[PDB]
């Protein structure tokens, strides 16, 4: 976008940080997906020292 | 051609240079020589406490006109 | 062109009125997640207090006018609960229809007030019950829908988009998308 | 000349009937996330056209980060005109609104 | 049919206030004061000094030039006053910023002193040249005028030396000459008053 009115709306209205919850039901849509999931079951395990 | 760009500069009337609309809000009420000469004494004094110097130079001839003599 | 107006009524673009509040409670969907999670809001009371910070805020909004009217509509409504809906007396219209939810503290949808009083009367736990009312009623006030919000596009994108997910066949009544297309 | 004088007089009377006075205004006292995203847009758009700036900008070259510094100090000289859908309106200075 | 058809055309072209001959001098009065209204664009560099901005952008390029709306040469202005967009006088007025651009547009009242020459009037100015085809003049030491040959009286002859003039009595005419106004020409960036000497 090519002016300052639109830069103030890609930072404050349509940025990704304000889009954490979707308005369909209020459920979150942003998070770690495949292998950061399967690494937290090993990192936060009880064997990890 | 080039003259199609010179008349963009010969016109040079943007919305920064010119007002958008002008409307007279009453009727033109005439004045007296004692009121013209009182005004030009104050209008020239206000601007002389750029542009406009080529204009004021034409007003001082009219200030010399209503009272003085070449 | 359906959007939240500044008097919290949902109106069309030409000004024709569609609803009088957004859903009856004027709450944004992306805000009401922990609004009824009262056990979470009590375990994190102090960390949630300097977010919904009330100290710099009690001079720009009336406080006691809506709390006074709410207890009339709460006491009068429990005296008439065994009656059916057509024998309900209409003395006390709800507090959202009398006070602006973003202007008056305590003006609160009557379903949130019932859940909040059911929590405080079955749970006796450095935090009072009086100051926990004051937090969860300011949290209702900060979770409201904003005026100008395009709730018409959102309501249409919240139906057409999960309907790209139910195109399937028989697993008696018309199912799925062809029912939704009627 | 008379048809304009009787036309401006209508227009300044119509816009007088639609101005809600400051004691009758009954909308939200918070800044509603779109007012914030346009005040910062319009103020940063004026700063880049050499408007006088009311904050000690410390080498900040982004015009938008300058206007976010003035909104933090309540120094922005703008006024929000909140329209109600009949055409009537309420004027709210940025100084008196509340920033979420 | 046509009685109330051309009235919205004829009254478009009839000028409003006619110039009177005054003070038993025979000369008309063409300087007039008209209050007008403008819709101007205040710029953000003049957002702290709004009155200097409306004068320097829109009012100063308007002086000593022919304006079509007031119908004359604008001499100067007096009493600039910005209309507030807040119908509450006061100092802290406020104007309305456009959405796309950072500029603001607003209404203003001002009094313009304009010079309004019209037909059938009397203007006395100095003769600056005279030749074998015309009599060229100034008006008020600023406004160019000319009297051509076909409106010179027949009883007046052009004696040749550049050349002097002979009236109906054998006298050179001075600079100050009284004449009656023909079509005022506009189309240049110079305002020209063509005139007549016959009655």
Q: What is the largest CA-CA distance in chain B?
A: 52
Query: Using an 8 Å Cβ cutoff, are E114 and E72 in contact?
Result: yes
Pairing between β-strand E127-130 and β-strand E134-139 as defined by DSSP bridges = antiparallel
Q: What CA–CA distance (Å, rounded) separates B21 from B16? A: 13
CB-based contacts of B46: which residues, under 8 Å, 6+ apart? none
CA distance D27 to chain C (A): 6
Kindly state the helix (H) or strand (E) to which residue C18 belongs, with its residue range: strand C17-19
**Residues of A engaging D, defined by a Cβ cutoff of 8 Å:** 3-9, 11-13
Query: Using an 8 Å Cβ cutoff, are E194 and E184 in contact?
Result: yes
Residue E54: both structure tokens together: 């409306």
In the C/D pair of chains, how many CB contacts fall below 8 A? 40
Domain that holds residue B17: 1-70
In the A/D pair of chains, how many CB contacts fall below 8 A? 33
Asked if the Cβ–Cβ distance from E36 to B29 is below 8 Å, we say no
Assess D37–A contact: CB distance below 8 Å, yes or no. Answer: yes
Q: What are phi and psi of E12, to 5 degrees?
A: -70, -30
Residue D73: both structure tokens together: 């100090």
Asked if the Cβ–Cβ distance from C157 to A21 is below 8 Å, we say no
CB-based contacts of E63: which residues, under 8 Å, 6+ apart? B52, B55, E74, E75, E76, E77
Assess D68–A contact: CB distance below 8 Å, yes or no. Answer: no
Assess E44–D contact: CB distance below 8 Å, yes or no. Answer: yes
> Residue C145 gets which letter from DSSP?
P
Query: Using an 8 Å Cβ cutoff, are E134 and D81 in contact?
Result: no
CA distance D19 to chain A (A): 27
Residue spans of alpha helices (H) in chain D: 2-17, 35-47, 63-72
Other beta carbons within 10 angstroms of residue E91's beta carbon come to 4
C-alpha pair distances (Å), E191 with each of C53, E74, E142, E186 = 70, 11, 10, 5
Asked if the Cβ–Cβ distance from A26 to C157 is below 8 Å, we say no
Q: What residues does E114 pair with on adjacent strands?
A: E32, E74
Asked if the Cβ–Cβ distance from A26 to C33 is below 8 Å, we say yes
> Residue C164 gets which letter from DSSP?
G
- CATH fold of E31-115: Dna Ligase; domain 1 (3.30.1490)
* Candidates A2, A4, A5, partner chain E, best to mutate (most E CBs within 10 A): A5
Q: What CA–CA distance (Å, rounded) separates C163 from C51? A: 37
How many domains are contained in chain B? 1
Q: What CA–CA distance (Å, rounded) separates E95 from E22? A: 44
Q: What CA–CA distance (Å, rounded) separates E118 from E184? A: 7
Domains and CATH numbers, chain D: 1-100 (3.90.940.10)
Asked if the Cβ–Cβ distance from D49 to E43 is below 8 Å, we say yes
Asked if the Cβ–Cβ distance from C30 to A21 is below 8 Å, we say yes
User: For residue C30, which residues of chain A lie inside 8 Å, CB to CB?
Assistant: 20-23, 26
Residue B35: both structure tokens together: 């009121």
Assess D34–B contact: CB distance below 8 Å, yes or no. Answer: no
Query: Using an 8 Å Cβ cutoff, are E48 and D52 in contact?
Result: yes
Experimental method: cryo-EM
Assess D20–A contact: CB distance below 8 Å, yes or no. Answer: no
For A25, which residue in chain C has the nearest alpha carbon?
C29
CA distance B1 to chain E (A): 23
Q: Touching A: which chains, 3+ CB pairs < 8 A? A: C, D, E
CATH number belonging to domain C26-146 = 1.10.357.120
For A5, which residue in chain E has the nearest alpha carbon?
E100
List, as ranges, residues 25-44 from A with C-beta within 8 Å of C: 25-26
CA-nearest of B18, E155, D30, B24 to C103 is D30
Q: What CA–CA distance (Å, rounded) separates C94 from C178? A: 38
Residue C18: both structure tokens together: 């569609």
User: For residue A3, which residues of chain E lie inside 8 Å, CB to CB?
Assistant: 100
For residue C43, the Cα-to-chain-centroid distance in whole angstroms is 22
10 Å CB burial of residue E171 (0-12, 13-18, 19+) is: exposed
Assess A16–E contact: CB distance below 8 Å, yes or no. Answer: no
Q: What residues does B14 pair with on adjacent strands?
A: none
CA-nearest of D41, D51, D48 to E47 is D51
> What one-character-per-residue DSSP string does chain E give?
--TTTTHHHHHHHS-SSPPPB-TTT--B--EEEEEEEEEEEE-GGGSSSHHHHHIIIIIGGGTTSEETTTTEEEEEEEEEEEPPSS----S----EE-SSSS-EEEEEEEEEEEE---TT-EEEE-EEEE-SSEEEEEETTTEEEEEEGGGS-TT-B--------B-TTS----S-EEEEEEEEE-SSSS-EEEEE---
Q: What CA–CA distance (Å, rounded) separates D75 from D95? A: 7
CA distance E57 to chain B (A): 6
10 Å CB burial of residue D44 (0-12, 13-18, 19+) is: buried
List, as ranges, residues 117-146 from C with C-beta within 8 Å of D: 142, 144, 146
Q: What CA–CA distance (Å, rounded) separates E111 from E81? A: 10
User: For residue E57, which residues of chain B lie inside 8 Å, CB to CB?
Assistant: 16-17
Tokens 């100095």 sit on residue: E126
Q: What CA–CA distance (Å, rounded) separates A17 from C120? A: 34
CA distance A23 to chain D (A): 17
Q: What residues does E180 pair with on adjacent strands?
A: E122, E196
Q: Is B12 helix (H, G, I), strand (E, B) or coil?
A: coil
* Candidates A9, A20, A26, A28, partner chain C, best to mutate (most C CBs within 10 A): A26
Residue C90: both structure tokens together: 């209409």
Query: Using an 8 Å Cβ cutoff, are E140 and E134 in contact?
Result: no
Assess A22–C contact: CB distance below 8 Å, yes or no. Answer: yes
For C11, which residue in chain D has the nearest alpha carbon?
D85
Asked if the Cβ–Cβ distance from C147 to D27 is below 8 Å, we say yes
C-alpha pair distances (Å), E133 with each of A22, E21, E181 = 87, 29, 18
Residue spans of alpha helices (H) in D18-89: 35-47, 63-72
User: For residue D98, which residues of chain C lie inside 8 Å, CB to CB?
Assistant: 57, 60
CA distance A36 to chain C (A): 25
Asked if the Cβ–Cβ distance from B16 to E41 is below 8 Å, we say yes
Q: What CA–CA distance (Å, rounded) separates D42 from A40? A: 45
Per the rule left: phi > 0, alpha: psi between -120 and 50, beta: everything else, E170 is left
Asked if the Cβ–Cβ distance from D5 to B27 is below 8 Å, we say no
């Amino acid at each position: 976008p090519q002016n300052e009115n639109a830069r103030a709306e890609a930072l404050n209205l349509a940025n990704t940080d304000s889009q954490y919850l979707t308005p369909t039901s209020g459920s979150p849509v942003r998070g770690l997906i495949q292998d950061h999931i399967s690494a937290g079951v090993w990192l936060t395990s009880k064997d990890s020292f | 051609m080039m003259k199609g760009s010179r008349r963009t500069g010969n016109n040079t009337a943007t919305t920064l240079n010119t007002p958008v609309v002008i409307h007279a809000t009453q009727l033109p009420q005439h004045v007296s020589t004692d009121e013209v000469l009182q005004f030009l004494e104050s209008f020239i004094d206000e601007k002389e406490n750029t542009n406009l110097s080529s204009s004021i130079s034409q007003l001082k001839r009219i200030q010399r006109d209503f009272k003085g003599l070449p | 062109g359906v959007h939240v107006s500044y008097d919290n009524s949902i109106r069309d673009a030409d000004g024709t009125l569609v609803q009088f509040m957004y859903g009856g409670d004027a709450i944004d969907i992306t805000k009401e997640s922990h609004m009824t999670q009262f056990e979470f809001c009590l375990d994190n009371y102090y960390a949630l207090l300097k977010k919904y910070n009330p100290s710099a805020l009690i001079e720009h909004l009336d406080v006691e006018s809506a709390l006074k009217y709410s207890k009339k509509t709460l006491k009068y409504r429990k005296k008439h609960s065994k009656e059916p809906h057509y024998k309900q007396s209409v003395k006390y219209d709800p507090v959202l229809a009398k006070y602006n939810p973003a202007k008056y503290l305590g003006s609160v949808s009557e379903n949130f007030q019932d859940k909040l009083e059911s929590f405080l009367d079955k749970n006796s736990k450095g935090v009072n019950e009086k100051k926990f009312r004051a937090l969860m009623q300011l949290k209702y006030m900060r979770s409201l829908i904003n005026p100008g919000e395009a709730v018409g596009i959102i309501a249409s994108q919240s139906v057409g988009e999960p309907s790209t997910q139910m195109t399937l066949n028989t697993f008696n009544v018309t199912l799925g998308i062809p029912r939704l297309r009627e | 000349p008379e048809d304009f004088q009787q036309h401006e007089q209508i227009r300044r009377k119509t816009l007088k009937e639609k101005a809600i006075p400051k004691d009758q205004r009954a909308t939200t006292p918070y800044m509603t996330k779109y007012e914030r995203a346009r005040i910062l847009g319009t103020r940063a758009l004026q700063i880049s056209m050499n408007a006088p700036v009311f904050v000690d900008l410390e080498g900040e070259t982004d015009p938008l980060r300058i206007a976010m510094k003035e909104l933090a100090e309540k120094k922005i000289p703008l006024v929000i005109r909140r329209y109600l859908p009949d055409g009537s309106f309420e004027d709210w200075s940025v100084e008196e609104l509340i920033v979420d | 049919n046509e009685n109330r058809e051309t009235a919205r055309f004829i009254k478009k072209h009839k000028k409003q206030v006619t110039n009177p001959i005054d003070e038993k001098n025979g000369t008309s009065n063409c300087i007039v004061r008209v209050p007008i209204a403008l819709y101007v664009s205040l710029a953000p560099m003049y957002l702290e000094n709004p009155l200097q901005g409306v004068m320097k952008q829109h009012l100063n390029p308007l002086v000593m030039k022919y304006n079509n709306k007031v119908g004359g040469v604008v001499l100067g202005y007096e009493g600039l006053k910005i209309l507030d967009a807040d119908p509450l006088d006061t100092s802290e007025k406020l104007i309305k910023i456009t959405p796309d651009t950072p500029f603001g547009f607003t209404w203003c009242h001002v009094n313009l002193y304009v010079w309004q020459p019209q037909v059938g009037d009397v203007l006395e100015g100095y003769i600056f040249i005279q030749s074998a085809s015309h009599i060229g003049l100034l008006i008020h030491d600023a406004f160019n005028a000319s009297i051509k040959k076909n409106n010179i009286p027949v009883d007046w002859t052009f004696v040749h030396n550049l050349g002097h003039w002979v009236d109906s009595n054998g006298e050179p005419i001075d600079g100050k000459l009284r004449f009656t106004v023909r079509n005022v020409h506009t189309t240049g960036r110079v305002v020209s008053v063509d005139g007549t000497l016959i009655s």
